[PDB]
């Protein structure tokens, strides 16, 4: 029953084209609402809501504080980018792919073909489906990217189809951790 | 290339609990354990390639608590409105019998960052092999969290994720079984 | 490699 009070501070570094263009943001929040913000383009603090005007006027009066935040694209952003570069921006983990039908049932009945892609990093991945060698872009549904919270993603790309005898459905996965595409086939059978 | 590194911090009253963590493209690099005053890396291998001085994090958490007391008064003690969480339970791999798997309980879109997550195996609380994450930040400035239960897929075993939050009138129970 | 810490600007008073 005791009322709570939350302060949040988020020092954000945004990188484009590696470190060729960097933007720094010094964001101060009260109850999930941004009150005052320093941005490496404006060069000083600004108040997003009126309730953070006193802090912006105060920090903008001190050149020592401003020269500290103006420098943070170089002494903080590009610095911490280089510290973790080898195991973050260059991290490559390949996924395990598994293809399985959603229902054990006869052919010529409607079915849903699941291509499960588990454990890749980074998130950039392309997943395709092939019916007898022809890519099929209709009837595809994806869960999107699922973060497992451990520096791996997963995703399920499902295919709606009516399976027929002799059909070979192929899931194809493309990912930076792999020099060649990953393919897993499913036999329709009888 | 396009990435986002975020150094995210918070302080909560009157709970007097703080958190300091780094975030890369949505993933936690490390957090500072306020109790032990030590850097805790999300993946143990990370500490072999980099280090971090926990006392600089503690400096900021002292600043944030003074910053919060000023802002609470400035707002005439405007409290935070609780937000209940969304709970989704899943596995990190397709389920096969006698093939080891991990249950993931995903708590999302909530605030303030205080929860009670309890794994249950057939109604029985399980406290062996469980692990969890700290509160991870969101771009809408809510929080998220992961809890993990490694298990052996069975036909007679049943699991539940029990999440208690102030935004909930009743403890939220999300279910899982071998037949999803 | 040592990670840096961006400081939080102190509120007046």
């Amino acid at each position: 029953t005791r009322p709570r009070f939350l302060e949040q501070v988020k020092h954000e570094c945004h990188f484009f084209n590696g470190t060729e263009r960097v933007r720094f943001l010094d964001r101060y929040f009260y109850h999930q609402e941004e009150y005052v913000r320093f941005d490496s383009d404006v060069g000083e603090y600004r108040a997003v809501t009126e309730l953070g005007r006193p802090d912006a006027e105060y920090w903008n009066s001190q050149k020592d504080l401003l020269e500290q935040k103006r420098a943070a694209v170089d002494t903080y952003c590009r610095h911490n980018y280089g510290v973790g570069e080898s195991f973050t921006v260059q991290r490559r983990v390949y996924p395990e792919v598994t293809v399985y039908p959603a229902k054990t049932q006869p052919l010529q009945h409607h079915n849903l073909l699941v291509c499960s892609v588990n454990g890749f990093y980074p998130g950039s991945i392309e997943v395709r489906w092939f019916r007898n060698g022809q890519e099929e872009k209709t009837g595809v549904v994806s869960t999107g990217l699922i973060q497992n919270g451990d520096w791996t993603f997963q995703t399920l790309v499902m295919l709606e189809t009516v399976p027929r005898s002799g059909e070979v459905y192929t899931c194809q996965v493309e990912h930076p951790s792999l020099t060649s595409p990953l393919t897993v086939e499913w036999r329709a059978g009888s | 290339e396009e990435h986002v590194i975020i150094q995210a911090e918070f302080y909560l009253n009157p709970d007097q609990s703080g958190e300091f963590m780094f975030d890369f493209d949505g993933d936690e690099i490390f957090h500072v354990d306020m109790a032990k005053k030590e850097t805790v890396w999300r993946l143990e291998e990370f500490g072999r390639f980099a280090s971090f001085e926990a006392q600089g994090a503690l400096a900021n958490i002292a600043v944030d608590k003074a910053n919060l007391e000023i802002m609470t008064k400035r707002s005439n003690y405007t409290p935070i409105t609780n937000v209940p969480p969304e709970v989704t339970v899943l596995t990190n791999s397709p389920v096969e019998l006698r093939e080891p798997n991990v249950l993931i309980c995903f708590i999302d879109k909530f605030t303030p960052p205080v929860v009670n997550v309890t794994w249950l195996r057939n109604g029985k609380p399980v406290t062996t092999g469980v692990s969890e994450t700290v509160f991870l930040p969101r771009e809408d400035h809510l929080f998220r969290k992961f809890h993990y239960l490694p298990f052996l897929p069975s036909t007679e075993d049943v699991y539940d994720c029990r999440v208690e939050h102030w935004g909930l009138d009743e403890p939220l129970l999300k279910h899982w079984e071998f037949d999803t | 490699g040592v990670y840096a810490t961006r400081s939080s600007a102190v509120r007046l008073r």
């Epitope: 420098a71 | 003074a66 | 961006r6």
Partner: T-cell receptor
Framework: GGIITQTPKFLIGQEGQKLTLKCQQN?????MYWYRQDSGKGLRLIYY???????QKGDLSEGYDASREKKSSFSLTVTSAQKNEMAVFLC?????????????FGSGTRLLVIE | GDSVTQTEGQVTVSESKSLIINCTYS????????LFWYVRYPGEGLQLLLK?????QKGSSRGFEATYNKETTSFHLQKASVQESDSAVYYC????????????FGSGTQLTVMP
């Protein structure tokens, strides 16, 4: 017109005596410091106090005790001048902005202990 | 080891002649250092003279200049033509960009410029 003054400028003491040094500043600086410049070399921090709570660091183990009730006054005492030491004590203060604010120093107190 | 070392003792130069006061630094816990020069004129306290917070940048004040050099891990103080009013003690100090680490001062180099 800012000033930071420590008293006394010169202070001779005997062994085991409890010698108190006082420093006050009118800069509205939240944090104050107490350094010890010894005959040889090196400034060495004995005590610093960010706002209203000190933090022993650097040179307490030599036997000191600080106190600070007002934002403007930082008091240093030598628990037991032992013995025949010769040292300058410098008082500093700085603004707590979160940035590296410039230190403002005092002239110094010359302490001399004799038998 | 998180420290600073500079020229030991005293340096004597002639008026209107070049001066160079070496300084270097080491680091273990400070992630991104900031570098400072402090001056103490005779019968006064230390005050800030120069200050550089960014890799490879040069700071200049009162005819002096120092370059934060990360390749040589130095911050040497230089001046083309010293005046008689520059006779003082110069200190090299080391902090962190966060502002959370107390300044690490050097031993101090004493400069006396003869007329």
């Amino acid at each position: 017109g800012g000033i930071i003054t420590q008293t006394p400028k010169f202070l001779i003491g005997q062994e085991g005596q409890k010698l108190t040094l006082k420093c006050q500043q009118n800069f509205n600086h939240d944090t104050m410091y107490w350094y010890r410049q010894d005959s040889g070399k090196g400034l060495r921090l004995i005590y610093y106090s960010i706002t209203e709570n000190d933090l022993q660091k650097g040179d307490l183990s030599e036997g000191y005790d600080a106190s600070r009730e007002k934002k403007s006054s930082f008091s240093l005492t030598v628990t037991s001048a032992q013995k025949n030491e010769m040292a300058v004590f410098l008082c500093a203060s700085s603004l707590r902005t979160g940035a590296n604010s410039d230190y403002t120093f005092g002239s110094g107190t010359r302490l001399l202990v004799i038998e | 080891g998180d420290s600073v070392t500079q020229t030991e003792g005293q340096v004597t130069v002639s008026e209107s002649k070049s001066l160079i006061i070496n300084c270097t630094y080491s680091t273990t816990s400070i992630a991104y250092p900031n570098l400072f020069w402090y001056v103490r004129y005779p019968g006064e306290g230390l005050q800030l003279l120069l200050k550089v917070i960014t890799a490879g940048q040069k700071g200049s004040s009162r005819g002096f200049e120092a370059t934060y050099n990360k390749e040589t891990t130095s911050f040497h103080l230089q001046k083309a033509s010293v005046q008689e009013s520059d006779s003082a003690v110069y200190y090299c100090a080391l902090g962190d960009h966060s502002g959370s680490w107390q300044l690490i001062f050097g031993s101090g180099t004493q400069l006396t410029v003869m007329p």
